[PDB]
Amino acid sequence: SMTDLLSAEDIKKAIGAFTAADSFDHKKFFQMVGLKKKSADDVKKVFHILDKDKSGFIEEDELGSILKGFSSDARDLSAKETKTLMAAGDKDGDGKIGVEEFSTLVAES
């Protein structure tokens, strides 16, 4: 569970800071949620939780619902947020975010 990996309190506060549509800043989210104090192995564990269909990649649908991954109470990302995140994250251009790509997003926060 996400709350097994990260602190519910940290999650609450990170979600709480990006309540308005278009306010998402992945670096600051990653920082607040506690993903910057996690080992690479824990990072990968988070990734697997986010990859809803276990395809090994975070596709557009899972990307839009990334916050729901952390707390089912969270909003979906707006269109500009999804577009912006995919663009920061997709280095090989397949339109998806793989494990390494996700790890890099986190590491650069």
CA dihedral 46, 52, 53, 55 (to 10 degrees): -30
Residue nearest to Ca ion (CB): 55
Query: CA angle, corner 64, sides to 86 and 9, nearest 5?
Result: 105
Considering only 66, 81, 90, 102, the residue that binds Ca ion (CB under 5 A) is 90
Residue 96 Rama label (left phi>0; alpha psi -120 to 50; beta): beta
Considering only 92, 100, 107, 108, the residue that binds Ca ion (CB under 5 A) is 92
**Contact range with Ca ion by CB under 5 A, out of 7-15, 39-47, 64-72, 92-100:** 92-100
Q: Which residues are annotated as a binding site for Ca(2+)?
A: 51, 53, 55, 57, 59, 62, 90, 92, 94, 96, 101
Nearest-approach distance from CB 54 to Ca ion, in angstroms: 7
* Total residues binding Ca ion (CB under 5 A): 7
CA distances to 6, 22, 33, 55, 72 from 38, rounded to whole Å, are: 9, 26, 10, 24, 22
**Contact range with Ca ion by CB under 5 A, out of 3-11, 22-30, 43-51, 66-74:** 43-51
